[PDB]
Each structure stands twice: as structure tokens, then as C-alpha cells.
Enzyme design. Structure first.
Site, short mmCIF file in Angstrom:
data_model
loop_
_atom_site.label_atom_id
_atom_site.label_comp_id
_atom_site.label_asym_id
_atom_site.label_seq_id
_atom_site.Cartn_x
_atom_site.Cartn_y
_atom_site.Cartn_z
N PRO A 17 16.29 -10.56 17.18
CA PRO A 17 14.85 -10.61 16.86
C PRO A 17 14.56 -11.30 15.53
O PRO A 17 13.42 -11.30 15.09
CB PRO A 17 14.48 -9.14 16.79
CG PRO A 17 15.72 -8.54 16.19
CD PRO A 17 16.84 -9.20 16.99
N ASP A 37 8.98 -5.58 13.34
CA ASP A 37 9.11 -6.89 13.97
C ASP A 37 8.40 -6.86 15.33
O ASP A 37 8.97 -6.43 16.34
CB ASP A 37 10.59 -7.25 14.15
CG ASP A 37 10.79 -8.70 14.57
OD1 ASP A 37 9.79 -9.35 14.99
OD2 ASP A 37 11.90 -9.28 14.51
N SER A 69 0.86 -1.22 0.00
CA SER A 69 0.00 0.00 0.00
C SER A 69 0.86 1.23 0.00
O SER A 69 1.89 1.28 0.68
CB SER A 69 -0.86 0.05 1.26
OG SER A 69 -1.03 -1.24 1.80
N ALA A 109 0.34 -1.00 5.85
CA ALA A 109 0.91 -1.93 6.81
C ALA A 109 2.32 -1.48 7.19
O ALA A 109 3.08 -1.02 6.33
CB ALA A 109 0.92 -3.34 6.28
N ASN A 142 5.27 0.97 2.24
CA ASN A 142 5.70 -0.16 3.06
C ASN A 142 7.23 -0.17 3.19
O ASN A 142 7.84 -1.23 3.40
CB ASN A 142 5.22 -1.49 2.48
CG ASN A 142 3.72 -1.56 2.30
OD1 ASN A 142 3.22 -1.76 1.19
ND2 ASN A 142 2.98 -1.39 3.40
N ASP A 167 10.83 -9.77 10.56
CA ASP A 167 11.83 -10.83 10.44
C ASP A 167 11.67 -11.72 9.20
O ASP A 167 12.47 -12.63 8.99
CB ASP A 167 11.95 -11.67 11.73
CG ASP A 167 10.71 -12.48 12.02
OD1 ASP A 167 10.18 -13.14 11.11
OD2 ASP A 167 10.18 -12.52 13.15
N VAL A 171 6.64 -9.74 16.36
CA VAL A 171 6.39 -11.17 16.60
C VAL A 171 7.68 -11.98 16.78
O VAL A 171 8.56 -11.97 15.92
CB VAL A 171 5.61 -11.80 15.44
CG1 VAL A 171 5.32 -13.26 15.73
CG2 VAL A 171 4.33 -11.03 15.15
N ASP A 172 7.78 -12.69 17.89
CA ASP A 172 8.92 -13.55 18.15
C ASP A 172 8.43 -14.98 18.44
O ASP A 172 7.29 -15.18 18.91
CB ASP A 172 9.73 -13.02 19.35
CG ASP A 172 10.50 -11.72 19.05
OD1 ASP A 172 10.78 -11.40 17.85
OD2 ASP A 172 10.87 -10.95 19.98
C1 LIG Z 1 -3.19 -3.72 2.58
C2 LIG Z 1 -2.35 -3.74 3.86
C3 LIG Z 1 -0.90 -3.56 3.52
O1 LIG Z 1 -0.33 -2.48 3.63
O2 LIG Z 1 -0.29 -4.55 3.13
C4 LIG Z 1 -2.84 -2.73 4.84
C5 LIG Z 1 -3.00 -3.13 6.16
C6 LIG Z 1 -3.48 -2.24 7.11
C7 LIG Z 1 -3.80 -0.94 6.73
C8 LIG Z 1 -3.64 -0.54 5.41
C9 LIG Z 1 -3.17 -1.44 4.45
CA LIG Z 2 10.97 -11.58 15.49
#
Ligand SMILES: C[C@@H](C(=O)O)c1ccccc1
Ligand SMILES: [Ca+2]
Lengths: 557, 206
Positions: A205, A73, A1, A69, A241, A252, A75-76
Site C-alpha cells: 500500500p 492509508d 491536532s 485527522a 495524530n 503512505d 488512498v492508492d
Molecule cells: C486539523 C485537521 C488535522 O488533524 O490535521 C483535522 C481534520 C479533521 C478533523 C479534525 C482536525
Molecule cells: Ca496507499
């Protein structure tokens, strides 16, 4: 996104511009849902995925918000110690602690029901993979137990009127998501929100940690640590992203990297190219980024250096010159099937060859497979998601940068061979491959374009509609499943704010029993295709003047 | 009126809800959702709770098991049970709103039932806050913020150390899967700030 926010210092004929393109793949009916809320402290308009109570993309006339999104990180994985003599227990802090368990039954249509057990530890749910008599892995999330808090934070943020009220809600969102802010006055902002673990000294991590107790997290980091910026001196906020902040560690995922090679640069380039942008120019960036080949800019210089001493009669030289003249913006031919220029085909073949000769050759099987993709791979239906620079390609990029790369090259991906030689060899494969398929006349090459499909199955692979309801679009566009733009203090309008979006195929996915499709079933599909958009109303006057139907319910709780 | 919920739809069918209190506002939201995307939401519910095999069959058993293995229902319910009345009104109103339309659908299916239910052979049922919350938990939290390949990473590192030796292997893992890369283009410019935290990149937990 992707997302780009343009503040007062870079906005033309406005004080602030926000353009958001969430990319979850394309579905029918639509990924998001347009909705307007007025009352109980809410006054908003926009659209949101799966119709969450809280709108991910929208505004309230004073501020506007968006997301992408975060991929930090958060999540471990903890390696739990088990004992055959104590089924159901694990060692934690010198004691055998009872795991949490539950019975589940999968009822199956026209089949026999199946029952199984799910196990959980203080670290998280047990993975049904990687399983031994002595070990089991638990997946630990920093956001565990804060799901509802995040949902409610996504809702409450709709009522914010300034940066301070807004960040107060972002601090409560525990998922790893990028939040963006803009307002009527021209202020813009950004917060890489979410819960992140405060890790023991020496905790890598990227790799598992023992679950016996000495490696348990200290707690969660404070909101002070979350990457954030309000009114950056650059005058804009762009994200695809990519990394939030200098020194901030990525997810990770082995296939996930924030390196010198990043698609977000394709946006920074366009925003910096022009001192100020108008709402229309800012919207235009969607069209340009959605057609932009992402690898051209990365390797063109390498290709130029390698072929700089070739004669024009050498076809490998001719391929690079073709790329040199190209802007990398793919356009469909009149057949609605092929691309005007063969650039992406050239890059794909060459790159695929480069990775096989370099990164792939240095990685032991079967892990080598992880770095072989060129990022162009696709099927007849077209990409299920966005296009990106592949992980192998990003690693290769550091390599061609030589010492300009800050990543120590522990092992030479070119294994002692001059880079030019390998680059020329891959160019040789490309000419061989392409020339044998399209003839020796590059100027008449008609290479396949990617198409786009609105799938009948949601991203889980579950039917959310009948197969026949799938929709097709000739031109694949590396853009948001939905696109929305909010413009504050527009100087050509009587309103302090204007907004637009596009929810394709349409607001409604309703089909009557007799097969009669709703009037708003597909009325935004063509609009999506031509980078069009429709107005989002907010004020009672606007909604009223654009009303189509009305209904009044009377109910008490 | 405090029990009034006005629904005005625009020229694109986009609904605007008008209501006095919280419960009524999200009631209208759920109501219009039920009208626009009932089949989509129903299948989304099954995708987030792992009950697709119930209506689609054996090809989805594995999918169902994996969904259930990736979340903890008690935990979700307890969170809901801890919600203040105002926050609860959000989830409760949304659920109720959907239920009002679903009750009309099952009362006059020959005209109001989305054709997909007919095609796939079942009818829609009532929603509860849990269901509404799970849509978010499953299509946002568990799917966009639940990423890790740590076990695979350790397998890669282990292979790299066997091929190149201990120190060289470690250094190669930092070449293919670096922790940070100072040349990474960032949303926030370096003039603004930087992340203060440094991390171990030698897998010292072993
Ligand atoms: C589509 C997804 C992403 O960026 O991968 C997302 C998740 C949460 C908010 C906006 C976009
Ligand atoms: Ca991790």
C-alpha cells in the site's frame, strides 16, 4: 491536532473530561464557527470548521465529541495503461474502456479565459503529473462517492445518546478521521473511523499498482476492522495524530511516520503523572504541550551518553548540561521576542547537523532533501501549522536506539563511525555556530522565539479577508486553532455538564462598508493568547440568561 | 408556530437557532452564517470549486485548474440527488438561509455589504446545496483525507535499489518508510486490542 479524554477513573471532581485542539493553522476570520442548534431532534452547542452543518467539536448535554485527522492509508494510485492509437481509453480487464471526461473553463478577472479537460477512470481522477504516451496515474480513494455520507454522518452523530447510537454514525463516516466520545456517566471512547480498502494479496500500500485490473481492490474493509476502544483500562484516550492501534498502518506519505518517536508521548506523560486530573488541570495540558520542545526528550539521553566523559571546560559538555537542566518548556523573555532558554536553538542546530551526517548522507539525491529538516524551520510570521518531530529525526531516533529499535537497520546511518563521535562532531558544529552568533556566555543567550500569525488567507492561500486584517501574537503556541473542553457531571456545578471554547479572533468577521468592525470581531483574541476560555451554553435558561440579541424569522419553504 | 425561527445570540455573538423542523433549523443556521462570515464563506466556495481567478485574476489560474482536477462534480450532484428528503432539507435549508440574508445584503448594500466585497470588487450570489456540500468536500475530504505520495515513494525505492542493490534497497526502504513500527505509541493500548491485518512490504505488485 491533539485530544485527550479523561474517564471516570482519572477524572477529579467530575466523571469525564474532553479537551480538543484541532490544528489547521491560524486564520482571520476564525477557522471555526460557533453555533447552537435546538429543535428537529437536535440540542447542541460548540463550534465547527467553515460552519459545516455538522459540528465537529461539541456536545448535547448527554455526550460530547471531537476529532483529529486520522492519516490512515485510504488512498492508492493505479497506473493506467494507455494507447496512442486510442486517445481517451485505458486497458482494464482485457478491454479498452472509455475514460470519463469533462470540459472546464477558468474565467479570469482581467485576463483571457482558459479551457481544459479533466479525465477520470474507474480508479479515480487522472493526475496532471507523471504523464506518458503509455501511462497515466489515477488517484483512488476508499471514500470515493461517500463525501455526502460523511457530512451527514458528522451531522447525525450530534443526536446520539450512547456509545451504540454513536458508533452507528461513525461507521458511516468514510473519511480518515479520529472520532472521540464522552458522556454524562463518565464513559469515554474512540474510533478511527473511515473507509479502508480490502487489498489483493501482495499489494504494498506504499507503492502504485497496475490499473489493468488484477490489482483492483476487493472492496472495503468492515467497520469491525476500524481501530476502536470503549472505556480503556488506562482510563484515558490521548491522540496527537499518532497511531490509533498496535499494528495499524499509517498514511503512505514519505514524510509521515508512526514510530518510537512521537509527540503524543508529551501528553501521555502529563496524564499519567497525576492519578486524577481536574477540568483545570486537563485544560492546563494545552499550555504545557504548546510550549514543549518535542526533541529534547528524544535525544537528550544520546547527548548525555556522548558527553559523559568530557570535562566541564569543554563547551560541548556545557551545551548538554544546559539541556539536562531544562524542562523544555519555552517561555518568552520580557522583550516579547526571545526565549528565556536557548534549548530549542541548541537542539535545532545539532539535530540539523546530525541528519546531514546520517540519514541524508545515506539517501541518494534528490531524495536526500526529504530527511534534512530538523522540524524547527520557520519564517518571520512563525509556523503556519503545528510543530512536530521531523521525519528525518524519527528515523534518526530508531538509529540511536540501536537494538532497542524494532526497525532493522539495513544500512548504518552512522556508516561505521562510533555514534558518540558523530554526536560529538555535531555538538562541535553547534557550539561553533551558536557561540559565534551569541558570544561564549550561554547564560546570556537570547535566541529567537517563534511568533504566531492569524493569516488573512485561508489554508488554500486564497484571501478570505483583506491583508490588513491579519492578526499577530507574540508567543507561538503549538496548540489547537481552537480549543474546547466539555466536562461531564462536574461536582461544583448545578448543571450535569459544563463546556468552554475559544474562537479567535472572534465569532464574527463582519466589517460594515464604512469600515466599522463588528463588536465580536476581535473580542476573543486576547483570551486565546493567555490560554483563557468562555462558556458554551446549552439549556434554554442559560442561553436566555446570557442573551445579547434576539430575532425571529417567519418563513415557509 | 412551525414557521418560526428564533435566533438568540450570546455575550460573544454566538448564535443559537430554535426551529420546529429540519429545513427551518438549518435555514437559521445558514442565515446567521451569512451574517457572520459572508466574505469568508464566499471565498471558501471559490476555493472549493476553483473559481478564485474569476475575482482575483491570473495568479490563481493554476490553483483553479488543480482544484477542478481533484474532484468530480457529477458525482457530487448525484449524491445530493440521492439524499432522502430529510437529509436534503439540511443542505437545502442551509442554502436558503444564506440566500435570505444575501438578498437583504444586495438590497441594501450601502449598509449591509461586507467591506471586503467592495474592496475586492464584486458582489455575493445565491447558494445551492451543491455549494454547501462542496465547502465540506473541499476543506475536509479533499484536503485532510486525500494524502498519498506513492509515485514519489516508488521513485525513492527505485533509487535505493540502484544504489544498494535489490534486496538491500528494499530493506532500506523499509528502514526510512516502514509500513508499521511496533514501538509506535498508540491511542489504543495493546492490552485492549491490535490490528489483525498484515501487509506486503516488498512491493510485490511488480
Ligand atoms: C486539523 C485537521 C488535522 O488533524 O490535521 C483535522 C481534520 C479533521 C478533523 C479534525 C482536525
Ligand atoms: Ca496507499
Amino acid at each position: 491536532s491533539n485530544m485527550w479524554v479523561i474517564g471516570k477513573s482519572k477524572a477529579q471532581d467530575a466523571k469525564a473530561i474532553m479537551v480538543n485542539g484541532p490544528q489547521a493553522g491560524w486564520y482571520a476570520p476564525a477557522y471555526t464557527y460557533g453555533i447552537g442548534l435546538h429543535g428537529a431532534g437536535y440540542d447542541v452547542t460548540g463550534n465547527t470548521p467553515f460552519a459545516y452543518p455538522g459540528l465537529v467539536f461539541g456536545h448535547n448535554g448527554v455526550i460530547s465529541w471531537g476529532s483529529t485527522a486520522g492519516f490512515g492509508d485510504d488512498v492508492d494510485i493505479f497506473a493506467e495503461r494507455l494507447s496512442a492509437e486510442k486517445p481517451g481509453y485505458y486497458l482494464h480487464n482485457g478491454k479498452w474502456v472509455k475514460m470519463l471526461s469533462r470540459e472546464e473553463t477558468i474565467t479570469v478577472k482581467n485576463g483571457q479565459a482558459e479551457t481544459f479537460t479533466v479525465w477520470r477512470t474507474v480508479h479515480g481522477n487522472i493526475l496532471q503529473t507523471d504523464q506518458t504516451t503509455q501511462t497515466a496515474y489515477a488517484k483512488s480513494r476508499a471514500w470515493d462517492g461517500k463525501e455526502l455520507a460523511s457530512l451527514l454522518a458528522w451531522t447525525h452523530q450530534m443526536k446520539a445518546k450512547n456509545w451504540q447510537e454513536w458508533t452507528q454514525q461513525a461507521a458511516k463516516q468514510a473519511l480518515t478521521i479520529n472520532w472521540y466520545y464522552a458522556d454524562v456517566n463518565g464513559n469515554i471512547g474512540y474510533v478511527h473511523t473511515g473507509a479502508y480498502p480490502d487489498r489483493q494479496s501482495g499489494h504494498d500500500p506504499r507503492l502504485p499498482v497496475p490499473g489493468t485490473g488484477k490489482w483492483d481492490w476487493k472492496g472495503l474493509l468492515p467497520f469491525e476492522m476500524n481501530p476502536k476502544v470503549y472505556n480503556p483500562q488506562s482510563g484515558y484516550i490521548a491522540n496527537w495524530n499518532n497511531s490509533p492501534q498496535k499494528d495499524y498502518p499509517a498514511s503512505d506519505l514519505f514524510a509521515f511516520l508512526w514510530g518510537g518517536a512521537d509527540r503524543v508521548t508529551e501528553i501521555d506523560r502529563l496524564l499519567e503523572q497525576k492519578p486524577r486530573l481536574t477540568a483545570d488541570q486537563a485544560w492546563d495540558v494545552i499550555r504545557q504541550t504548546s510550549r514543549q520542545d518535542l526533541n529534547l526528550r528524544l535525544f537528550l539521553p544520546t547527548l548525555q551518553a556522548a558527553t559523559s566523559g568530557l570535562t566541564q571546560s569543554d563547551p560541548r559538555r556545557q551545551l548538554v548540561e544546559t539541556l539536562t537542566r531544562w524542562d523544555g518548556i519555552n517561555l518568552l523573555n520580557d522583550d516579547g521576542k526571545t526565549w528565556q532558554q536557548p534549548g530549542s536553538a541548541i537542539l535545532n542546530v545539532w539535530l540539523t547537523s546530525m541528519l546531514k551526517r546520517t540519514v541524508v548522507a545515506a539517501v541518494p539525491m534528490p531524495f536526500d532533501k526529504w530527511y534534512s529538516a530538523s522540524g524547527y524551520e520557520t519564517t518571520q510570521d512563525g509556523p503556519t501549522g503545528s510543530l512536530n518531530i521531523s521525519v528525518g529525526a524519527k528515523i534518526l531516533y530508531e538509529a540511536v536506539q540501536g537494538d532497542k529499535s524494532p526497525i532493522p537497520q539495513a544500512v548504518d546511518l552512522f556508516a561505521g563511525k562510533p555514534q558518540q563521535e558523530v554526536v560529538l562532531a555535531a555538538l562541535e558544529d553547534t557550539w561553533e555556530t551558536l557561540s559565534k552568533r551569541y558570544g561564549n556566555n550561554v547564560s546570556n543567550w537570547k535566541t529567537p522565539a517563534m511568533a504566531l500569525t492569524f493569516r488573512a488567507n485561508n489554508f488554500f492561500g486564497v484571501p478570505q479577508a483583506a491583508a490588513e486584517e491579519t492578526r499577530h501574537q507574540a508567543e507561538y503556541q503549538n496548540r489547537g486553532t481552537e480549543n474546547d473542553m466539555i466536562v461531564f457531571s462536574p461536582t461544583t456545578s448545578d448543571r450535569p455538564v459544563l463546556a468552554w471554547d475559544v474562537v479567535a479572533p472572534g465569532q464574527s468577521g463582519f466589517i460594515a462598508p464604512d469600515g466599522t468592525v463588528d463588536k465580536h470581531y476581535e473580542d476573543q483574541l486576547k483570551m486565546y493568547e493567555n490560554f483563557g476560555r468562555k462558556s458554551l451554553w446549552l439549556t434554554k435558561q442559560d442561553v436566555e440568561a446570557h442573551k445579547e440579541s434576539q430575532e425571529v424569522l417567519h418563513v415557509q419553504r | 408556530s412551525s414557521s418560526e425561527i428564533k435566533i438568540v445570540r450570546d455575550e460573544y455573538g454566538m448564535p443559537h437557532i430554535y426551529a420546529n423542523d429540519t429545513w427551518h433549523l438549518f435555514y437559521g443556521y445558514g442565515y446567521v452564517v451569512a451574517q457572520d462570515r459572508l466574505f469568508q464563506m464566499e471565498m471558501a466556495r471559490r476555493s472549493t470549486q476553483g473559481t478564485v481567478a474569476e475575482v482575483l485574476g491570473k495568479d490563481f489560474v493554476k490553483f483553479d485548474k488543480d482544484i477542478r482536477r481533484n474532484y468530480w462534480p457529477d458525482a457530487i450532484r448525484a449524491q445530493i440527488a440521492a439524499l432522502s428528503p430529510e437529509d436534503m432539507s439540511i443542505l437545502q435549508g442551509y442554502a436558503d438561509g444564506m440566500n435570505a440574508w444575501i438578498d437583504k445584503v444586495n438590497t441594501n448594500p450601502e449598509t449591509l455589504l461586507p467591506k471586503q466585497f467592495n474592496t475586492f470588487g464584486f458582489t455575493p450570489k445565491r447558494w445551492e446545496p451543491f455549494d454547501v456540500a462542496m465547502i465540506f468536500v473541499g476543506t475536509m475530504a479533499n484536503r485532510f483525507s486525500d494524502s498519498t505520495s506513492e509515485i514519489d515513494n516508488l521513485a525513492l525505492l527505485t533509487a535505493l535499489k540502484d544504489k544498494y542493490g535489490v534486496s538491500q534497497g528494499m530493506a532500506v526502504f523499509n528502514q526510512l518508510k516502514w509500513l508499521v513500527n511496533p514501538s509506535a505509541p498508540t491511542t489504543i493500548a495493546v492490552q485492549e486490542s491490535n490490528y489483525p491485518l498484515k501487509f506486503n512490504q516488498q512491493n510485490s505488485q511488480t
